[PDB]
């Protein structure tokens, strides 16, 4: 019969109507029997009391002259209308057209494990909001929490200023009365402080090929047309001749980027957007070595991402066990052709864990390979063949083959081609070394005849042959 309220679950704000028969503001005590015999003073018919023990209690109210009122009060008459929480800050990103909202969970003032829920609510300039969405939030007793909400602008890019709001509702399994909805926070306003001349948003953005993206236009002059690459779109008034269009679904711009332009009677305000494919899992990946100084990795780009320079993918090759690594970035666009990346290796080593990571401001892609270097030795082509006489029937055939080959040994071939005969091919092995000339004794020849030599090399563990040499071509020799 004595209707109550509370902001937190600590103190009851209880008011009763006066006992009719001219007794007005002649109020002395209001007494409660709970914990102890406590008695509170009065100025008028309502008062601020400490929340008591669940159950029924004798609440008597004394009036000055004679009377006194006898009131049965509980926990389940009381309603819990929480305080208005205030928005602490409203830092806003402009690059990404997005909002951050941070407030004080006054959890310091609300007892024990208690699930409480928030109706946040945004808005721009139209008669209603973009978003009004609700957060689950369980509350930690005692410790105030500093909880966030990271929302992002569906539509424009802050060219049109936003308001935000938040009401919260507490529950408690250790409270009994009508768990009630609080009320709306005093609204919070964020705004553009015009940075540049520019009047159309957003500039220079890169987006996923075929992306339902929205773009807007701050204008002085009633805007007549809005179009991406001659396909004008039906444009929609936002507020002050400042207007916006939807790019339905976007085809991947070329190198120069797709242009979206607006025209008013007077001037022309416009914007470039780049439409992209993230890089594709790089393809036919296989590394080898022609020298034993450095490893090289062949690979194919894949689907070409349609983008250029800064945006063109940046392939990075990473030897794990080494730590050593290198980088690829071509300004011109990529092909169906295959490119190679020139990584160093510390002497010998062997075990090799390769990670090729193509990055491009939209997504990542990565394939790996694992290589026993000394199993990939597939050397350059041998050069500068000199031939030196020993006897009539024998010659010293020698060349120079680039590469650290001191650990390994190579076996080479000698196409001793003589005139008008079958190709005599010889298979002899030699000990290799540091960027060095190699020497072969060649025998069982014919004195004074039309010889021609070819050399062709690989490691005795062999990956693949050298190319075929050049042409040595020499005669033989006599006695007298």
């Amino acid at each position: 019969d004595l209707k109550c309220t509370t902001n937190n679950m600590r103190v009851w704000d209880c008011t009763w109507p006066a006992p009719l028969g001219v007794s007005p503001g002649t109020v002395k005590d209001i007494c409660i029997k709970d914990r102890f015999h406590s008695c509170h003073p009065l100025e008028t018919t309502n008062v601020k009391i400490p929340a008591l023990s669940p159950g029924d209690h004798e609440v008597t109210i004394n009036y000055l002259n004679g009377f006194q009122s006898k009131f049965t009060l509980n926990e389940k008459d009381v309603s819990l209308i929480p305080e208005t929480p205030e928005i602490l800050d409203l830092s806003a990103d402009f690059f990404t057209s997005s909002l951050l909202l941070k407030w004080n969970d006054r959890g310091s003032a609300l007892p024990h494990p208690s699930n409480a829920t928030w109706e946040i609510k945004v808005l721009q300039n139209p008669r209603t909001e973009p978003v009004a969405l609700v957060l689950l939030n369980t509350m930690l007793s005692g410790k105030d929490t500093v909880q966030h909400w990271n929302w992002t602008s569906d539509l424009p890019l802050q060219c049109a200023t936003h308001s935000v709001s938040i009401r919260w509702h507490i529950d408690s399994p250790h409270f009994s009365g009508y768990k009630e909805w609080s009320d709306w926070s005093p609204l919070k306003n964020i705004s553009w402080i015009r940075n540049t001349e520019t009047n159309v948003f957003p500039q220079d953005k890169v987006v996923l090929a075929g992306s339902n993206m929205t773009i807007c236009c701050m204008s002085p002059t009633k805007v007549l047309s809005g179009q991406i690459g001659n396909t004008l779109r039906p444009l929609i008034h936002l507020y002050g001749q400042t207007v916006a269009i939807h790019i339905l679904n976007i085809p991947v711009s070329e190198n120069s980027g797709t242009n979206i332009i607006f025209i008013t009677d007077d001037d022309v305000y416009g914007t470039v957007v780049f439409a992209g494919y993230p890089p594709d899992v790089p393809q036919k990946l296989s590394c080898e070595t022609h020298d034993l100084k450095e490893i090289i990795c062949s690979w194919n780009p894949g689907r070409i991402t349609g983008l250029v320079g800064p945006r063109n993918t940046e392939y990075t090759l990473f030897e794990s066990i080494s730590g050593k690594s290198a980088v690829f970035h071509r300004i011109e666009g990529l092909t169906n052709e295959t490119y190679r990346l020139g990584v160093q290796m510390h002497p010998g080593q062997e075990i090799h864990n390769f990670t090729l990571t193509g990055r491009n401001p939209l997504g990542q892609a990565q394939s790996a390979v694992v290589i026993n270097v000394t199993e990939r030795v597939a050397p350059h082509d041998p050069t500068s063949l000199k031939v030196k006489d020993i006897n009539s029937t024998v010659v010293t055939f020698s060349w120079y083959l680039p590469g650290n080959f001191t650990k390994i040994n190579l076996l080479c071939q000698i196409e001793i081609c003589k005139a008008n005969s079958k190709k005599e091919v010889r298979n002899a092995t030699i000990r290799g070394a540091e960027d060095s000339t190699y020497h072969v004794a060649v025998d069982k020849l014919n004195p004074y005849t039309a010889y021609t030599f070819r050399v062709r090399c690989s490691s005795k563990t062999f990956w693949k042959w050298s190319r075929w040499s050049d042409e040595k071509r020499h005669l033989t020799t006599e006695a007298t």
């Binding site: 070329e254 190198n255 980027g257």
Partner: protein
């Protein structure tokens, strides 16, 4: 990389000396640029993507203001000094318009080739022009202004500003190369 380049600090003190004839070189050189012009402008706007060729006058309007004056008559000196500025002016900005296209349209070798030669020849006309503006004229140093693009910011604008500049160039060379 291909390097265009137009000198600002020109001086009868420091400049590169020249061959013979002079006037009839800068006549030839002048009206030569006039040739390329159209096609190089075509080429520019062409690859700036749609809808650039269909709004050719609203976007690539022969317009960019603050532009170095030219007067029709007056003594060789006037014509020559005046020209000199215009030259300084384009080649300054013209370099930039390239250093742009160098990363926006790095595929049209077709465009660079032009852009690049239209700088080379432009540089010549310069030394050749002052080379006369120094032999029986003695100004000492033509005082000058620098072209557009401090930033320019937006890709977009950088296209318009280049589409506009090229527009006037096209519009201006056609006078220049007739007058003297």
């Amino acid at each position: 990389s291909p390097l265009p380049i137009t000198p600002v600090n020109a001086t009868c003190a420091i400049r590169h000396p020249c061959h013979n004839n002079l006037m009839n070189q800068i006549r030839s050189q002048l009206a030569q640029l006039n040739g390329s012009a159209n096609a190089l402008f075509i080429l520019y706007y062409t690859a700036q993507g749609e809808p650039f060729p269909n709004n050719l006058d609203k976007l690539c309007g022969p317009n960019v203001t603050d532009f170095p004056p030219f007067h029709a008559n007056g003594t060789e000196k006037a014509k020559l000094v005046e020209l000199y500025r215009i030259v300084v002016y384009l080649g300054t900005s013209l370099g930039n318009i390239t250093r742009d296209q160098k990363i926006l349209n790095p595929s049209a070798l077709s465009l660079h080739s032009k852009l690049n030669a239209t700088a080379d020849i432009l540089r010549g006309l310069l030394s050749n022009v002052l080379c006369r503006l120094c032999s029986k004229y003695h100004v000492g140093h033509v005082d000058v202004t620098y072209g557009p693009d401090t930033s320019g910011k937006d890709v977009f604008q950088k296209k318009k500003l280049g589409c506009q500049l090229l527009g006037k160039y096209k519009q201006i060379i056609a006078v220049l190369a007739q007058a003297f």
